[PDB]
Amino acid sequence: EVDKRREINNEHPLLMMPLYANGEEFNQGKYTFWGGDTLTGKWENIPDDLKPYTVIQLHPDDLPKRDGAARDFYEHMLEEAAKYVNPKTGKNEPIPVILTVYTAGNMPYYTSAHWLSTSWIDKMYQKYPNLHGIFSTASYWIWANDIENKAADYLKVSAKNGGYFIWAEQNSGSAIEKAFGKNGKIAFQKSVDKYWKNLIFMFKNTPAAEGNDSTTESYMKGLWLSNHTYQWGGLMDTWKWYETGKWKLFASGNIGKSQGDRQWLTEPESMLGEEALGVYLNGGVVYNFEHPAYTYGVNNKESLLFSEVIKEFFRYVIAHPAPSKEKVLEDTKVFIHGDYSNKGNGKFFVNVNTDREQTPLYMTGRYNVIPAIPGVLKTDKLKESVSSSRIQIKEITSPEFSSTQARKEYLNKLYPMNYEGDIFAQKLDNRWFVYNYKVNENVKQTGKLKFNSLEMNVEFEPHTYGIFERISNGLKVNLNNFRTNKDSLWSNAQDANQAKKLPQLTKKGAIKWIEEHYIKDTQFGEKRVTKIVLRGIDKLPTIHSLSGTNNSYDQPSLNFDQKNHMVTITINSNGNLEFELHFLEH
Ligand SMILES: CC(=O)N[C@@H]1[C@@H](O)[C@H](O[C@@H]2O[C@H](CO)[C@H](O)[C@H](O[C@H]3O[C@H](CO)[C@H](O)[C@H](O)[C@H]3NC(C)=O)[C@H]2O[C@@H]2O[C@@H](C)[C@@H](O)[C@@H](O)[C@@H]2O)[C@@H](CO)O[C@H]1O
């Protein structure tokens, strides 16, 4: 083994920072990115505490589809990255980079990436110590003839150089199963046997109308636990709103895939944190997002979605490392072996732990994410682990998995009910993680959680998550319900028929909208109410270390009921929020 160029694990998670090449400007002789970020400017803006855990991911987007274009653009940017000087210290501090080398099956009618040879990749790895990895993304919809053969070469060239091959894919058309050899293309399967320690496999939740979120995430977790990948994670994509045909928040009717650039702006900001929790809580450590202009920012400035949700969530997973592989293994009661493509794909988990076919969220944390691997793989390395002796490994074709009812009856016997209420909640150590799982319906949810004898009841509106940690002196609270008002994008349309017919915002139009109406002059959402009730409390709790999104919260209200040893906490806010409550139990 060659020394790894960087660590990627629970203590060293990874936030990929995408920069998409502007092909139109490249034709004019300029080296720029859609949305106006610059490589140096973006890197500089990244908070210093995050720099060790973030990597610039270059993407060739609409560069000319012919030989030389992607090489030219990439070499220019690798040179900029390599030569970077920190203006504070005057020292050359090479910017870490990942190159997108494969996308859309590398078809010459789809991407300039077609003309990036494995030879050239090897050359860049050898020239640039700051090239930490290469990235393949979104070929599920165009599963090219030699995709597995090329993936094998990408993994091997990365291992040769101590870099990572990172592959983001969704299980549409059995993609994950095919990648590992379901249909007889076994080159990547064999490559993985040798080189898995240099592989990161991620979901890509874009094609949301096909409902493969839960099954793909289950595979990513299972591949990791079974040593088919070094780590895992997810690319969470606001374009899911477009794929599923949604429009104005909470509105009636479906507009189909008709208003792309309005649609990728509309997903509630806090809902990205809800999606990301599914990665974190299940031991994933790699995060990436689209659309980049909304999820990260423009013009070397952080979008509010980035500043108030993603940055804060990512800081949380650095401060509180995800459960280790050993820990997740010890917690796993059931491990599925087989092809979800043969068992309804995403439907497998509907009314088990998802509330509908088309969602990136879960309705219960009772089973967390049940890990799986495709039928083509073996569970040999899984069973060899010291930590896997108590797992029931089950074929997906087992009677226990034959129907929705059978799945719950089987799982319920192994995963006890550990909270009450129709809401998402999952517990790790002394922390309850809670969210409202409604996607596009304005419905409050309630749950009853316990820390031993201490009872905590919560009431959450949609697009609200909380993390509640029992500390020696009380409770630490992290709350995020940040959701700005996107109604202006859907102006002039009273119903779905009118919305579908709106003039296209366009890619350039949406970038402009971000600049003029999101980065500044933001239409903030209304403050909304969260209730927390604690029962089993000695005296009126005190509040400490209160902070959150500027101008986004009223002072929390505490109402202590002496006779009933309980407090009702009422919060009115729209943003991220943090505080401690100090109290003793009664
Ligand atoms: C031939 C064809 O139409 N192929 C489609 C894929 O490109 C789709 O992939 C992504 O889908 C999104 C819609 O759900 C969207 O089209 C996205 O590209 C757009 O957004 C990115 C940033 O998020 C860039 O700005 C692109 O320039 C822009 N393109 C357009 C036409 O508006 C697609 O993602 C990009 O392309 C894929 C191939 C990868 O390279 C990604 O990394 C890129 O971000 C796919 C969705 O399921 O559907 C296919 O039909």
Side-chain angles (χ1 to χ4, degrees), residues 2-87 89-90 92-325 327-383 385-562 564-586:
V2 175
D3 287 348
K4 294 287 195 69
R5 293 183 180 213
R6 72 176 301 101
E7 183 62 275
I8 301 167
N9 68 11
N10 61 338
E11 295 184 337
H12 298 88
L14 174 58
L15 174 61
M16 298 176 67
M17 305 291 298
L19 291 178
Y20 277 52
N22 182 327
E24 303 187 351
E25 294 194 355
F26 183 79
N27 287 332
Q28 297 174 302
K30 301 177 275 191
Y31 292 82
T32 54
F33 300 102
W34 286 108
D37 289 339
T38 61
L39 197 154
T40 289
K42 187 168 198 82
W43 181 254
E44 290 198 335
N45 195 218
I46 296 173
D48 287 333
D49 64 302
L50 292 193
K51 278 185 172 82
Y53 307 102
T54 59
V55 175
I56 296 301
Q57 168 226 330
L58 305 178
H59 191 290
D61 202 3
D62 61 344
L63 288 170
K65 301 174 274 180
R66 51 173 182 272
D67 190 69
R71 289 195 303 279
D72 174 332
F73 186 94
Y74 280 170
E75 291 172 6
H76 182 279
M77 294 303 165
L78 286 159
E79 280 293 293
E80 190 185 330
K83 279 156 160 45
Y84 174 70
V85 161
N86 187 347
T89 64
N92 177 37
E93 296 184 341
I95 295 167
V97 166
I98 284 163
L99 296 179
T100 306
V101 298
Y102 193 99
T103 193
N106 267 192
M107 297 301 188
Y109 46 92
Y110 288 149
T111 181
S112 63
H114 175 89
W115 296 270
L116 297 174
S117 73
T118 305
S119 176
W120 179 85
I121 295 167
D122 203 4
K123 187 188 174 181
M124 298 301 100
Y125 266 134
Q126 291 182 41
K127 184 169 177 165
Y128 296 103
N130 58 310
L131 179 58
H132 285 5
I134 58 184
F135 186 46
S136 173
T137 182
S139 299
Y140 52 84
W141 58 276
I142 178 58
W143 202 254
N145 278 349
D146 52 349
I147 187 173
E148 303 89 351
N149 291 341
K150 292 191 62 49
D153 293 341
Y154 296 136
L155 184 52
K156 180 175 183 208
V157 72
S158 302
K160 169 177 196 274
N161 289 108
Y164 294 89
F165 176 46
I166 303 166
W167 195 351
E169 223 39 282
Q170 207 67 337
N171 199 47
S172 294
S174 308
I176 310 305
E177 306 159 8
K178 290 188 293 196
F180 286 96
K182 174 177 173 73
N183 291 345
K185 301 283 184 46
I186 62 179
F188 187 67
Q189 180 196 291
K190 293 167 188 243
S191 187
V192 162
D193 198 62
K194 294 199 281 295
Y195 301 125
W196 67 273
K197 291 193 291 300
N198 291 256
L199 174 66
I200 306 291
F201 223 125
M202 301 165 75
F203 68 75
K204 184 183 200 278
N205 75 10
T206 311
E210 283 71 63
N212 299 125
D213 297 61
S214 55
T215 50
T216 309
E217 185 164 55
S218 166
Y219 281 156
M220 293 305 139
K221 186 184 181 174
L223 289 166
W224 172 58
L225 290 180
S226 62
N227 296 1
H228 298 273
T229 188
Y230 185 61
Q231 311 293 336
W232 73 277
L235 190 160
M236 290 146 286
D237 188 358
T238 67
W239 281 99
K240 70 172 69 65
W241 212 260
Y242 162 78
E243 292 289 324
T244 61
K246 300 175 172 66
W247 62 297
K248 173 167 76 175
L249 190 68
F250 300 140
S252 181
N254 190 282
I255 67 162
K257 302 184 197 184
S258 65
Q259 288 291 331
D261 303 290
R262 297 179 193 283
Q263 287 167 294
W264 62 254
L265 284 163
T266 302
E267 177 172 348
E269 291 88 345
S270 56
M271 188 175 155
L272 282 305
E274 295 174 343
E275 298 178 32
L277 276 168
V279 176
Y280 173 72
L281 292 171
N282 293 103
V285 307
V286 186
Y287 303 84
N288 198 355
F289 300 87
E290 292 180 59
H291 184 300
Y294 175 36
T295 56
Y296 293 88
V298 292
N299 301 312
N300 300 324
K301 295 187 183 183
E302 302 180 350
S303 69
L304 284 155
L305 165 44
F306 189 84
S307 65
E308 305 316 303
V309 178
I310 293 165
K311 174 167 72 188
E312 286 309 309
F313 181 90
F314 191 64
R315 282 171 164 160
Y316 187 89
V317 314
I318 291 166
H320 299 87
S324 66
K325 192 199 287 167
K327 175 65 180 154
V328 182
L329 248 7
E330 298 172 345
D331 291 352
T332 299
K333 298 312 165 199
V334 175
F335 190 109
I336 294 171
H337 173 60
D339 296 334
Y340 287 121
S341 63
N342 188 47
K343 286 290 170 172
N345 293 297
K347 295 184 176 62
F348 192 92
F349 286 112
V350 178
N351 293 124
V352 183
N353 61 9
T354 63
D355 80 330
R356 78 193 73 189
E357 300 177 348
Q358 297 168 48
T359 178
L361 313 178
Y362 293 96
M363 69 175 185
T364 182
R366 183 178 177 164
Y367 326 111
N368 48 273
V369 162
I370 299 292
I373 63 184
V376 67
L377 297 175
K378 294 174 179 149
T379 51
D380 291 2
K381 296 177 278 173
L382 179 67
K383 292 157 174 287
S385 168
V386 289
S387 311
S388 72
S389 74
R390 294 182 173 88
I391 308 175
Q392 290 189 22
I393 304 164
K394 299 285 279 182
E395 295 297 325
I396 202 178
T397 50
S398 297
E400 286 91 350
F401 302 131
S402 63
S403 69
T404 310
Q405 195 193 346
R407 289 164 210 141
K408 275 183 290 192
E409 285 173 25
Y410 173 65
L411 291 175
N412 285 349
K413 296 165 194 135
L414 292 171
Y415 290 95
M417 189 188 284
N418 72 341
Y419 70 101
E420 293 161 39
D422 179 25
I423 195 168
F424 174 88
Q426 189 178 330
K427 193 177 189 179
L428 272 175
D429 49 92
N430 302 116
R431 297 171 287 159
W432 272 108
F433 297 80
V434 183
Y435 67 66
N436 180 308
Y437 66 78
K438 297 291 193 179
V439 177
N440 197 209
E441 308 74 43
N442 195 4
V443 172
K444 292 180 188 83
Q445 292 182 336
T446 54
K448 183 193 297 193
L449 301 317
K450 297 179 178 189
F451 302 90
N452 296 116
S453 304
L454 179 64
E455 292 176 40
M456 180 182 68
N457 294 258
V458 299
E459 313 206 345
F460 275 17
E461 287 196 5
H463 321 118
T464 305
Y465 62 97
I467 306 172
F468 304 88
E469 179 172 12
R470 185 73 173 100
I471 52 173
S472 68
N473 52 350
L475 194 71
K476 177 157 194 177
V477 176
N478 284 267
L479 183 71
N480 197 309
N481 67 344
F482 189 59
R483 186 180 75 196
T484 69
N485 184 357
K486 299 287 170 43
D487 284 356
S488 70
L489 295 169
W490 301 103
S491 290
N492 305 335
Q494 68 191 70
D495 58 35
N497 179 253
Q498 298 185 342
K500 185 169 188 89
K501 283 164 184 187
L502 291 168
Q504 295 299 118
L505 177 54
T506 77
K507 170 168 185 179
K508 286 176 180 171
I511 290 165
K512 189 155 200 167
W513 185 87
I514 293 170
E515 290 169 323
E516 303 179 347
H517 303 295
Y518 195 69
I519 295 295
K520 68 183 178 187
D521 295 331
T522 311
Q523 299 303 107
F524 293 101
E526 296 296 312
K527 294 190 180 70
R528 52 226 190 92
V529 172
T530 300
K531 291 174 60 185
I532 303 160
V533 175
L534 300 172
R535 286 172 167 92
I537 300 299
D538 193 41
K539 292 195 268 78
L540 164 66
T542 49
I543 192 162
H544 299 86
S545 307
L546 179 62
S547 65
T549 302
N550 184 43
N551 306 136
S552 74
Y553 63 93
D554 294 337
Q555 298 299 116
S557 170
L558 276 67
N559 188 356
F560 179 68
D561 177 359
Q562 225 312 127
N564 285 311
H565 298 288
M566 69 182 284
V567 65
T568 298
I569 305 129
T570 304
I571 298 159
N572 185 226
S573 67
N574 190 135
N576 68 54
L577 187 70
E578 185 190 70
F579 57 93
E580 291 176 15
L581 296 167
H582 295 177
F583 56 85
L584 302 178
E585 287 185 58
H586 177 73

